[PDB]
Amino acid sequence: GHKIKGTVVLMRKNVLDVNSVTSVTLDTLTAFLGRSVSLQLISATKADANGKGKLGKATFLEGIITSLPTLGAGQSAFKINFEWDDGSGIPGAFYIKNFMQTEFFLVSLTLEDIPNHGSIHFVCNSWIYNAKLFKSDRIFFANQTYLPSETPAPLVKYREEELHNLRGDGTGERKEWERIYDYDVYNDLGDPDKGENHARPVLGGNDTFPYPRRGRTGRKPTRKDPNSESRSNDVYLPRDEAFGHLKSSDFLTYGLKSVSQNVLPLLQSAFDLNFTPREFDSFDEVHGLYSGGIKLPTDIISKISPLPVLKEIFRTDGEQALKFPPPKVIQVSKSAWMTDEEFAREMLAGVNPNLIRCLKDFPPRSKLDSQVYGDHTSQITKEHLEPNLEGLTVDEAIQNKRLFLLDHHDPIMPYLRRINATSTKAYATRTILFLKNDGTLRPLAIELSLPHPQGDQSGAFSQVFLPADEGVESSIWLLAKAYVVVNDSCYHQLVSHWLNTHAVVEPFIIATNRHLSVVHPIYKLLHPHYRDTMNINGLARLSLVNDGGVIEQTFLWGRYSVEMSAVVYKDWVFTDQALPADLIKRGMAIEDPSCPHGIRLVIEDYPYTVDGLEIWDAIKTWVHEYVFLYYKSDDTLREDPELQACWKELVEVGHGDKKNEPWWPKMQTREELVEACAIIIWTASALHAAVNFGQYPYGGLILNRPTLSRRFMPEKGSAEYEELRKNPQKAYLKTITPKFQTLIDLSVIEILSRHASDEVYLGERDNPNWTSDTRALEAFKRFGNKLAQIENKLSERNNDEKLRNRCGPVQMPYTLLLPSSKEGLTFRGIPNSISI
Ligand SMILES: [Fe+3]
Numbered sequence: 001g002h003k004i005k006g007t008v009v010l011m012r013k014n015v016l017d018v019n020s021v022t023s024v025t026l027d028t029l030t031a032f033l034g035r036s037v038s039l040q041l042i043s044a045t046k047a048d049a050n051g052k053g054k055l056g057k058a059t060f061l062e063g064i065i066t067s068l069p070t071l072g073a074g075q076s077a078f079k080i081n082f083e084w085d086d087g088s089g090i091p092g093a094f095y096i097k098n099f100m101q102t103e104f105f106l107v108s109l110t111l112e113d114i115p116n117h118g119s120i121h122f123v124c125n126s127w128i129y130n131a132k133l134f135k136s137d138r139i140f141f142a143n144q145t146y147l148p149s150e151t152p153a154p155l156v157k158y159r160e161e162e163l164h165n166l167r168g169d170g171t172g173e174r175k176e177w178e179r180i181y182d183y184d185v186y187n188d189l190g191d192p193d194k195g196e197n198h199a200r201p202v203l204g205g206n207d208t209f210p211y212p213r214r215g216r217t218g219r220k221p222t223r224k225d226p227n228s229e230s231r232s233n234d235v236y237l238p239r240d241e242a243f244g245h246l247k248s249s250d251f252l253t254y255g256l257k258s259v260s261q262n263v264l265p266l267l268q269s270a271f272d273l274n275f276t277p278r279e280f281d282s283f284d285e286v287h288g289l290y291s292g293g294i295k296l297p298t299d300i301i302s303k304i305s306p307l308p309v310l311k312e313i314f315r316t317d318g319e320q321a322l323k324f325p326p327p328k329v330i331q332v333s334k335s336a337w338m339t340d341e342e343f344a345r346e347m348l349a350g351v352n353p354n355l356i357r358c359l360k361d362f363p364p365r366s367k368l369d370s371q372v373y374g375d376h377t378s379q380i381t382k383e384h385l386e387p388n389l390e391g392l393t394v395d396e397a398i399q400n401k402r403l404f405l406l407d408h409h410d411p412i413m414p415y416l417r418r419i420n421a422t423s424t425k426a427y428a429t430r431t432i433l434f435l436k437n438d439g440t441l442r443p444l445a446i447e448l449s450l451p452h453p454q455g456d457q458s459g460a461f462s463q464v465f466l467p468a469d470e471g472v473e474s475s476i477w478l479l480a481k482a483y484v485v486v487n488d489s490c491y492h493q494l495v496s497h498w499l500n501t502h503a504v505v506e507p508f509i510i511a512t513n514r515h516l517s518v519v520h521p522i523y524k525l526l527h528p529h530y531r532d533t534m535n536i537n538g539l540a541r542l543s544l545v546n547d548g549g550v551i552e553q554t555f556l557w558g559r560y561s562v563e564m565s566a567v568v569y570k571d572w573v574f575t576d577q578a579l580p581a582d583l584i585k586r587g588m589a590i591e592d593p594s595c596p597h598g599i600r601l602v603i604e605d606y607p608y609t610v611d612g613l614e615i616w617d618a619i620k621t622w623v624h625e626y627v628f629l630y631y632k633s634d635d636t637l638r639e640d641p642e643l644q645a646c647w648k649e650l651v652e653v654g655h656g657d658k659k660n661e662p663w664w665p666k667m668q669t670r671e672e673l674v675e676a677c678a679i680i681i682w683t684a685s686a687l688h689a690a691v692n693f694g695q696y697p698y699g700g701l702i703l704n705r706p707t708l709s710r711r712f713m714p715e716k717g718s719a720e721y722e723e724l725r726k727n728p729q730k731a732y733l734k735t736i737t738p739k740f741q742t743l744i745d746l747s748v749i750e751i752l753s754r755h756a757s758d759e760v761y762l763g764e765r766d767n768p769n770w771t772s773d774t775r776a777l778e779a780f781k782r783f784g785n786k787l788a789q790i791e792n793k794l795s796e797r798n799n800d801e802k803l804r805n806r807c808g809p810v811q812m813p814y815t816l817l818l819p820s821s822k823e824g825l826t827f828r829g830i831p832n833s834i835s836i
């Protein structure tokens with residue numbers, strides 16, 4: 001016959017494992033070499049008795065390869081030669097068995113060949129556990145992308161069985177070594193076994209709290225409630241969805257889990273004891289968090305300094321102190337955050353730049369049901385509006401599209417009575433803003449509403465606040481804006497960020513692994529965009545969005561945080577997530593064929609939107625060229641059974657509480673697929689980036705983005721209005737997030753706002769050689785060069801002195817949508833995925 005020459009690249013557990021890597025020819029690789037690892041090649045063109053591809057001989061690893069041009073940090077290569085000939089046909093897949101015992105990460109196999117056949121490459125990227133754990137061996141396919149014509153006949157069944165194996169069905173407790181993808185509802189956030197103070201409602205699968213599904217973990221049900229799932233310190237995810245890293249430090253989720261499992265208890269021990277004041281007393285003390293920091297006791301700066309990942313996150317000085325980095329919002333001016341101009345600017349270029357709407361009718365109305373803040377309206381009046389600017393009437397301002405609204409009235413309202421019985425004291429707020437002739441936005445009125453004067457039957461008890469530049473009235477005004485911000489923070493955290501990116505995306509990763517083979521073109525398109533997502537979500541179920549967790553302890557909606565986001569999810573519409581649709585729904589753009597992206601913006605200098613359209617367009621373009629390389633006609637897409645079962649399950653099961661909505665694209669047209677794939681990529685990439693990487697740079701100062709309010713507005717004559725009059729900084733501080741919780745927030749948002757050093761960016765960036773299809777490689781290249789052109793374009797805008805909203809009084813250039821970034825707390829970079 002002949003020998004096919006093989007190269008296997010893999011990575012040792014010790015090189016990727018969090019417990020080993022902390023730290024980061026003696027020759028360890030010898031153990032991979034006797035009878036330790038086998039491979040068996042599978043024919044793509046020659047079949048057995050009943051259709052299935054013929055198997056070569058299981059062949060063991062033969063020899064260490066010291067060096068190759070393409071090798072790479074932490075990678076080890078091994079020679080292996082497969083006995084094969086003309087008659088065995090061409091290899092298209094292979095089986096690997098690891099007899100070793102310790103798992104390793106299989107990166108790739110390269111076969112240099114026989115025939116006029118070129119090299120066959122296989123990109124595996126899978127941890128291979130001990131063969132005894134399996135039943136049918138780990139299978140990998142070559143490079144070649146194939147619609148489910150599935151394609152080569154001898155591989156058709158292997159293609160289908162791999163998927164059947166991945167779906168696993170839906171019983172059993174899920175184990176570490178497994179790769180089994182399925183759905184469940186959010187029945188695991190509570191701890192009712194610890195008491196019914198800790199029970200939380202199940203989210204999804206019901207009409208009160210509909211929600212996307214999450215990865216099934218199959219633990220045993222709680223003792224006290226058989227519809228909730230026992231808690232574990234170890235949350236399952238399909239193995240391989242959990243990314244390892246070569247540098248200690250890039251294990252960001254470790255740092256998050258440790259903030260709570262370790263840094264928290266031992267920050268109380270110097271509060272719940274007493275080495276540091278329990279409360280801030282001036283704005284100067286908040287700023288010293290970035291300068292000399294807080295001094296702590298040696299006992300406990302030794303418990304929270306010699307732990308993993310958290311070194312390169314808090315800055316020590318000599319000894320005691322836990323320093324924070326100065327956030328960008330204060331780097332040029334420490335006081336600009338208080339400006340009305342910066343308050344309004346942040347609704348266009350801030351952490352949550354998503355929400356503003358154009359006022360179409362007046363006064364603003366509520367969509368709440370039968371009481372009257374809400375069938376009719378808001379209590380802001382025409383005389384409340386126009387102070388120093390241009391003498392248009394409200395009707396004229398509206399007609400000329402110059403009035404805008406930030407409406408945080410309806411979601412918190414029905415829960416206000418309850419949240420206001422805790423330590424939290426909160427309002428439902430609306431804000432009206434006006435676009436000046438200078439193109440910057442100005443806040444004109446803030447309405448602060450509470451429930452049920454008497455009741456919850458004709459219901460709003462509201463007061464309105466108007467701008468003031470001097471005196472007690474200007475402190476009252478700063479407190480009004482804070483009542484707005486605390487509302488905005490919470491909606492940003494639970495809805496714009498958690499729900500709208502993390503939660504909603506997860507069912508797509510499940511649907512995709514369950515139904516599209518790794519060889520499917522659509523699987524390859526989308527795959528980079530799911531990196532580490534299920535992992536970050538698995539940890540947020542454990543430590544972020546859970547009954548005792550940091551989100552419940554920090555943000556306004558408290559204990560009702562997650563259920564409230566399920567109610568918001570009642571209004572979530574997939575196709576309104578596309579940016580252009582989002583802008584039109586909010587009144588922020590109008591369809592217009594004259595213009596650069598078919599859209600004319602109201603507010604031209606809206607940073608998020610103007611930069612985001614560029615990125616949106618670039619993704620849709622790439623998604624179009626790709627999908628039209630593979631789908632010859634709309635009929636070809638209607639005929640794809642993997643794409644159609646994937647879509648069906650997504651709509652019917654994954655996002656199953658919305659199964660009967662009318663807006664779901666039917667995958668009957670190639671355009672509809674491009675639209676859905678662009679939305680998914682958008683969500684996981686640029687939207688998530690926009691709403692996540694500005695958290696520390698903007699909210700790293702608690703004063704600017706407080707997370708909760710604890711005191712009602714000082715009244716009239718009272719002592720607290722007199723205290724306001726005397727030491728307004730202290731009255732400000734009494735109202736917002738206390739020092740303790742500020743510390744935890746900062747610690748968490750600091751890690752969130754960082755990019756790991758091994759992040760993979762949109763930027764044209766991908767893992768290795770993911771496809772042997774040269775047209776797709778090329779189109780992919782055109783996509784990166786476009787991103788590079790847009791990066792220049794956007795940098796040019798930040799240097800355009802006429803676009804004041806891009807900088808503001810804070811002198812903080814909007815760079816969140818620049819595709820490239822170096823790493824760390826940067827204020828930029830678009831990851832392919834929701835990876836933190
Ligand atoms: Fe995130």
